[PDB]
From Swiss-Prot:
It is found in: Secreted. This is Carboxypeptidase inhibitor. Potent competitive inhibitor of metallo-carboxypeptidases CPA1, CPA2, CPB, CPN, and TAF1a. Also inhibits human CPA4. Accelerates fibrinolysis in vitro and may contribute to the maintenance of host blood liquidity during feeding. One of its GO terms (cellular component) is extracellular region. Belongs to the protease inhibitor I68 family. One of its GO terms (molecular function) is enzyme inhibitor activity. Keywords: Fibrinolytic toxin, Hemostasis impairing toxin, Metalloenzyme inhibitor, Metalloprotease inhibitor, Protease inhibitor, Secreted, Signal, Toxin. Its main location: secreted. The keyword Repressor does not apply. It comes from the Eukaryota.
């Protein structure tokens, strides 16, 4: 099991898209990068202030008030 050790899902080829299909093994069908399927929620995300140049994403941070800038990475 590789996709367990890396921290992804095992969704089928019909459910997840053709691009999210990782090359790792151990699943029942195909591995799917849940970190990169959704957005800020995919790994958990972070609001930081408008003073700090980072990333912008209207999906979640749009009502953060103080620091309406959603940032997320692979880690």
């Amino acid at each position: 099991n590789e996709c367990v050790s890396k921290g992804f899902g095992c969704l089928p080829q019909s459910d997840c898209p053709q691009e999210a299909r990782l090359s790792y093994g151990g699943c029942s069908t195909v591995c799917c990068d849940l970190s990169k399927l959704t957005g800020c929620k995919g790994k958990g995300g972070e609001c930081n202030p408008l003073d700090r140049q980072c990333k912008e994403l209207q999906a979640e941070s749009a009502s953060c008030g103080k620091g309406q800038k959603c940032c997320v990475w692979l880690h």
